[PDB]
Amino acid sequence: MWFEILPGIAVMAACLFIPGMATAHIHKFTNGGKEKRVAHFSYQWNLMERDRRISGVNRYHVTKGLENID
Amino acid sequence: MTMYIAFILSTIFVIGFVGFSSKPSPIYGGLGLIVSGGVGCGIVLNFGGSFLGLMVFLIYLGGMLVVFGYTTAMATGDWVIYDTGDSGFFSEEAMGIAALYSYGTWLVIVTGWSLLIGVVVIMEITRGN
Amino acid sequence: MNIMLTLLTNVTLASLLVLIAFWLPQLNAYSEKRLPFSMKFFLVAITFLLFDLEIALLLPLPWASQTNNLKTMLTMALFLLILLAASLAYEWTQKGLEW
Amino acid sequence: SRGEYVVAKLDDLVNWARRSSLWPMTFGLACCAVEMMHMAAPRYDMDRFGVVFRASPRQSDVMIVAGTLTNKMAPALRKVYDQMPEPRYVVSMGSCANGGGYYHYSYSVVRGCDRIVPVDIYVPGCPPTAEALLYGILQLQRKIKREKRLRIWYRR
Amino acid sequence: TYKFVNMREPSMDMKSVTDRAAQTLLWTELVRGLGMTLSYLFREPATINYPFEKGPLSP
Amino acid sequence: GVLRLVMELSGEMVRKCDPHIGLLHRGTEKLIEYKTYLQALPYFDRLDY
Amino acid sequence: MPLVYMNIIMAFAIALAGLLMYRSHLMSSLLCLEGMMLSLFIMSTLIILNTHFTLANMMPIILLVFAACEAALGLSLLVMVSNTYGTDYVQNLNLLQC
Amino acid sequence: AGRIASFLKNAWAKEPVLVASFAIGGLAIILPSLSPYTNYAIRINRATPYNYPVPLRDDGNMPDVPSHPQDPQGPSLEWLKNL
Amino acid sequence: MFMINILSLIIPILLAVAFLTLVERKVLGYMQLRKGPNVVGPYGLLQPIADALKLFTKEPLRPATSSISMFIIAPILALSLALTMWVPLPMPYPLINMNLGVLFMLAMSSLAVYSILWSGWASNSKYALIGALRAVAQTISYEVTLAIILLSVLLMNGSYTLSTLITTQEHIWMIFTSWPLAMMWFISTLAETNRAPFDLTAGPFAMFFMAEYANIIMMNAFTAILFLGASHDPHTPELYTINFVLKTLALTITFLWIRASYPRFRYDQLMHLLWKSFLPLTLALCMWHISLPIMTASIPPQS
Numbered sequence A: 001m002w003f004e005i006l007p008g009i010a011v012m013a014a015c016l017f018i019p020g021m022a023t024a025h026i027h028k029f030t031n032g033g034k035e036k037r038v039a040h041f042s043y044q045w046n047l048m049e050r051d052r053r054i055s056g057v058n059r060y061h062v063t064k065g066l067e068n069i070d
Numbered sequence B: 001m002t003m004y005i006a007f008i009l010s011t012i013f014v015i016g017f018v019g020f021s022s023k024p025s026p027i028y029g030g031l032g033l034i035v036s037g038g039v040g041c042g043i044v045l046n047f048g049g050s051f052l053g054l055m056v057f058l059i060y061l062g063g064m065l066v067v068f069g070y071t072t073a074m075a076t077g078d079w080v081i082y083d084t085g086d087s088g089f090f091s092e093e094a095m096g097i098a099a100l101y102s103y104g105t106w107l108v109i110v111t112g113w114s115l116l117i118g119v120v121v122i123m124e125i126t127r128g129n
Numbered sequence C: 001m002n003i004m005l006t007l008l009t010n011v012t013l014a015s016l017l018v019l020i021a022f023w024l025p026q027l028n029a030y031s032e033k034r035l036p037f038s039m040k041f042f043l044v045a046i047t048f049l050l051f052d053l054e055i056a057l058l059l060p061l062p063w064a065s066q067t068n069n070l071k072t073m074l075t076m077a078l079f080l081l082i083l084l085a086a087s088l089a090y091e092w093t094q095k096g097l098e099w
Numbered sequence D: 001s002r003g004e005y006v007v008a009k010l011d012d013l014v015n016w017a018r019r020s021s022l023w024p025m026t027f028g029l030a031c032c033a034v035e036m037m038h039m040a041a042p043r044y045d046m047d048r049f050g051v052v053f054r055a056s057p058r059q060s061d062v063m064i065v066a067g068t069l070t071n072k073m074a075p076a077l078r079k080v081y082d083q084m085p086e087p088r089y090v091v092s093m094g095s096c097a098n099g100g101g102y103y104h105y106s107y108s109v110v111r112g113c114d115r116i117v118p119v120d121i122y123v124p125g126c127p128p129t130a131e132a133l134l135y136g137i138l139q140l141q142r143k144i145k146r147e148k149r150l151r152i153w154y155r156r
Numbered sequence E: 001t002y003k004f005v006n007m008r009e010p011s012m013d014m015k016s017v018t019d020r021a022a023q024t025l026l027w028t029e030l031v032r033g034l035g036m037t038l039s040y041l042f043r044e045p046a047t048i049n050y051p052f053e054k055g056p057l058s059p
Numbered sequence F: 001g002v003l004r005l006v007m008e009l010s011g012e013m014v015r016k017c018d019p020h021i022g023l024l025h026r027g028t029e030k031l032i033e034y035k036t037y038l039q040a041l042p043y044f045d046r047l048d049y
Numbered sequence G: 001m002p003l004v005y006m007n008i009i010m011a012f013a014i015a016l017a018g019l020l021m022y023r024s025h026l027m028s029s030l031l032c033l034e035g036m037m038l039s040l041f042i043m044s045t046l047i048i049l050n051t052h053f054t055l056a057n058m059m060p061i062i063l064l065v066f067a068a069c070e071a072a073l074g075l076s077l078l079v080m081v082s083n084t085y086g087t088d089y090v091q092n093l094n095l096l097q098c
Numbered sequence H: 001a002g003r004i005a006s007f008l009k010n011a012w013a014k015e016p017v018l019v020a021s022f023a024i025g026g027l028a029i030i031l032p033s034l035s036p037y038t039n040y041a042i043r044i045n046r047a048t049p050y051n052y053p054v055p056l057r058d059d060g061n062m063p064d065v066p067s068h069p070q071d072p073q074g075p076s077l078e079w080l081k082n083l
Numbered sequence I: 001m002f003m004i005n006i007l008s009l010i011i012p013i014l015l016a017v018a019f020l021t022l023v024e025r026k027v028l029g030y031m032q033l034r035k036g037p038n039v040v041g042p043y044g045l046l047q048p049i050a051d052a053l054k055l056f057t058k059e060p061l062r063p064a065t066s067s068i069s070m071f072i073i074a075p076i077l078a079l080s081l082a083l084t085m086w087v088p089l090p091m092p093y094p095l096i097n098m099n100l101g102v103l104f105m106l107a108m109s110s111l112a113v114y115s116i117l118w119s120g121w122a123s124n125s126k127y128a129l130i131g132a133l134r135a136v137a138q139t140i141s142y143e144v145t146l147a148i149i150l151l152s153v154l155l156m157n158g159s160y161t162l163s164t165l166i167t168t169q170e171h172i173w174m175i176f177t178s179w180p181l182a183m184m185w186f187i188s189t190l191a192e193t194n195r196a197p198f199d200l201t202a203g204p205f206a207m208f209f210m211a212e213y214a215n216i217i218m219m220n221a222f223t224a225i226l227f228l229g230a231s232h233d234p235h236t237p238e239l240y241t242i243n244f245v246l247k248t249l250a251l252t253i254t255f256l257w258i259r260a261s262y263p264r265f266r267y268d269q270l271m272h273l274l275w276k277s278f279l280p281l282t283l284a285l286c287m288w289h290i291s292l293p294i295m296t297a298s299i300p301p302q303s
């Protein structure tokens, strides 16, 4: 019956699940467990560069908290 | 300094212009012009002109060279002079381009009249008789 | 950089897959044995080009909407669209859209 | 040795791939074509076997000759056969294509389509039923399964 | 006796004209055809499982 | 079925159409003259199939 | 004056010389004109972006638009010329002589 | 009156696409001049700070210029909150 | 790990195309009171693999007189454009976060016609050249209205960023705000991919088929993102991914439904359809959507 179309469709769904999900996980893996920082407009880029400089390990996602203010 | 990527792109642009300037097999001249247009749009995009580079890539390549090939088918140092400041919370290119409607009223009027007259002229010329 | 890596990967994958598809059946031995120039199509191409130019003019509209001069911007956008419609109408009434 | 095992397995894979998707071009010459259109009909459903409906000559695998071949038509059929990519198989459907049939003793009928192109399967009938043509198609699939090209190339 | 197949005159009142305009602009008969096809999707097919099932015959 | 069609066109419009037939000419009418009436009956099944 | 501007001007000069050689195929003349236009667009865009002339960002687009319209006109003319001879050969236009 | 109505009725039949398009275009031209919210859009655009507000040097003769953002004087955005 | 991301975006798309065909055959069969392939594999699941293996082992017919160059580049360009057109799509996070994503997408779609033109010209046949010219004319004609509808819809978004489209549709779908533009957009996407009712026209042939079907799936995904906005929660993007994929599948099945439900247009009929029904309404709705935010003081934020 018509549900015999469901298997192949399901396969397609799986094939369409992989890309987006993958991106998210990679964005969590390369950005220290947080969302990848988006930078348009050249002000967010300056914020990211300042974060990288004050990080000390040349990685922007490493966040310095209030414990670093002495 | 990536081996003067801008200089490399400019050299490729000049090479393509020389290649299609000999005009061999005008379809191949058109293809060389397509490659040169891609290289030039790449130069503009690398410089920071995202909207203008995309405007080249869309208008020029996808409309004008497409119509050219269609009609033919019917027949037989850098990185230094740049700035140091920031642009704010927008892109200056987009603001300057969008100012066409608030600042460039005269430009819009003359361009629209020219385009309408161009449509009329094309119809009159291709009427035939 | 990242966009160039992506474009290079896409082009390389397409080229490699096309080449292997074109060369896999080429290892096994086998037998191995005008003028008319219709004008209406050219008019279609030219009309597309002109309307494409007018869309190129219309494109900066999303950013044109934040200027504090909303009346002038609206007037010019409507003027451009009205002249686009007028071009369409003139091509229509001159039997330029017929087959 | 392993050399014969690998070629045997690859040959099995290629045979399965080729016989599990047969894309036929059909010459609807005469009445037999009607029964052809009844094997693509819902009851028999050629498509469910991997046999696509009305493939183009440039990407067709099997040629079905369904009807009488006349002298005026033989060059066109031969030209279409020459165009087909290999591997190509020809199926003779009905008495008219098999041996001329009811028009065997005629001045304008080719006495069998195998005078022009080689034929792999002969389906008898006037016309063969859609079930009979399906049986012929499955027999052609079995014949494809029996063939062995990589083994012959290895032993040669 | 004979019938006419295409000898009808559409009404030219405002309501009928508006109905025809709604048909033209909103593609109602196209949706009707889509619905007919969709209804056909959900009913049992007529395909038999050859060669395990055979078509009916006669003596 | 099988049909050959030779047509001249000026642009999109058809200026002249000319069908070439006989690609399914089997000579039924001549074959009927060699059969009895009962023997000639099955040809009419094949005429308009 | 940097080297990229020199390269773009060299491309413009090469396209102009190719337009002025005139081997055949008036379509090639139109192609050379469009190449010169592309060079002009690229270099004007670079100059305007480099100096942050915010308003002058209107100028490239406009140029493009206008020049593309010219191309259309030119194409139309070419067609009519071909409509007389069947080919776009340059030497076919020898009826007028100085 | 009658001729215009008959023309509109004859256009609504056999040509509804053009009638709808012309109606939409005319409405788009006419309505913004009559709407009261266009000034609200202008004011919203005016209140979006894209640039840093450069302070003014005080001279003792600007009672309408605040000394602190929390000070009562200066433009207010309560109307925008109410929207 | 950017190469891994590129590959994980590139391979599943091709697999989804390969099985899209199985679904396409099966949906049409069950809509025609029959079945699709159900012999090759448990439910026809091995049918795409058999098709691919057969097509890659069949001899190629090089025209023996054609320009081998363009004959090779044309599938290269088709596949490259089809795969590149997926990179800025946010699902919910794009592979490449573009400021002007929609312009990049439009430019690639504009490039798409070079493959058709080159394939027609290199075929070394007058009839194939005429067919290619007809296809190119139809494609450019409908891409004009695609662009106009796209900018009219984006006027409600505030920018050309594709991710912002998620924020714009956080409370309501854009289909409710503008359904007529959505209807015209759907028909124009049908006419762009040469799909019925507008389908007027071994290795390289398979390449072209995969490019076209990837274009179909992508167009439906773009339509789902543009007009049927799924809610995204930043702490679990999987919900948005599932919603987006389900809507894309629904739109693709609707495409197959339309293919199975209708006759086909003539060339002049679809040309007239566009140039005399879609363009005037598109221009009128463009004026309406320009003026509406100013009328209602509802201009989107970003500038």
Ligand SMILES: CCCCCCCCCCCCCCCCC[C@@H](O)O[C@H](CO[C@H](O)CCCCCCCCCCCCCCC)COP(=O)(O)OCC[N+](C)(C)C
Binding pocket: B102, B103, B105, B106, B109, B113, C069, C071, C072, C075, C076, C079
């Ligand atoms: C006085 C002579 C009249 C007869 C001669 C006419 C000559 C040819 C016709 C074209 C000339 C029209 C005059 C328009 C000049 C533009 C400048 C003026 O209009 O002010 C503008 C006012 O804009 C108005 O909206 C102009 C509307 C008029 C244009 C619409 C229709 C024009 C059609 C004219 C002919 C075109 C072809 C024919 C069509 C039928 C500027 O706006 P504004 O906000 O102050 O300043 C912006 C700068 N800021 C940002 C620093 C503040």
Ligand SMILES: CCCCCCCCCCCCCCCCC[C@@H](O)O[C@H](CO[C@H](O)CCCCCCCCCCCCCCC)COP(=O)(O)OCC[N+](C)(C)C
Binding pocket: D009, D010, D012, D013, D016, D020, I039, I041, I049, I053
């Ligand atoms: C990731 C790397 C890929 C590299 C390239 C490989 C491409 C993909 C390979 C996967 C393909 C799967 C093959 C599975 C086919 C078996 C199907 C099975 O059902 O067939 C049965 C078994 O038949 C045959 O024996 C199957 C032989 C198939 C090949 C055997 C294993 C070969 C795998 C080796 C592949 C490695 C490639 C290495 C080079 C790259 C009989 O069915 P059949 O008779 O039809 O139908 C009868 C109809 N009835 C039932 C209704 C009556």
Ligand SMILES: CCCCCCCC/C=C\CCCCCCCC(=O)O[C@H](COC(=O)CCCCCCC/C=C/CCCCCCCC)COP(=O)(O)OCCN
Binding pocket: C082, C085, C086, C088, C089, C092, C093, H008, H011, H015, H018, H019, H020, H021, H022, H023, H024, H025, H026, I276, I279, I280, I281, I283, I284
């Ligand atoms: C200045 C305001 C403009 C703003 C709106 C514009 C938006 C875009 C619409 C215009 C685009 C160009 C349209 C050009 C029209 C061409 C007319 C024409 O010549 O076509 C006629 C057909 O057109 C006509 O019938 C004549 C005009 C009919 C009326 C058009 C609208 C007039 C005003 C109606 C709306 C008024 C306001 C709405 C009132 C209704 C209540 C809501 C011939 O048709 P064929 O295709 O050749 O058919 C041959 C095969 N049978």
Ligand SMILES: CCCCCCCC/C=C\CCCCCCCC(=O)O[C@H](COC(=O)CCCCCCC/C=C/CCCCCCCC)COP(=O)(O)OCCN
Binding pocket: E024, E025, E026, E027, E030, E031, H014, H015, H017, H020, H024, I180, I182, I183, I184, I186, I187, I197, I223, I227, I258, I262, I273, I277, I278, I281, I288
């Ligand atoms: C209060 C302020 C309101 C402002 C005004 C706005 C109101 C808008 C009112 C009108 C909106 C309607 C516009 C929609 C587009 C209409 C275009 C049209 O009518 O074209 C048809 C033709 O359209 C078609 O036939 C295309 C159909 C092609 C087959 C596809 C099947 C369609 C059904 C599939 C479902 C569609 C789903 C759409 C949305 C998808 C989700 C994104 C005309 O053709 P003919 O009847 O032959 O006449 C021409 C000669 N006079």
Ligand code: SF4
Binding pocket: D030, D031, D032, D033, D067, D068, D093, D094, D095, D096, D097, D101, D102, D125, D126, D127, D128, F046, F049
């Ligand atoms: S083979 Fe028999 S049934 Fe088929 S066309 Fe000939 S006479 Fe008719």
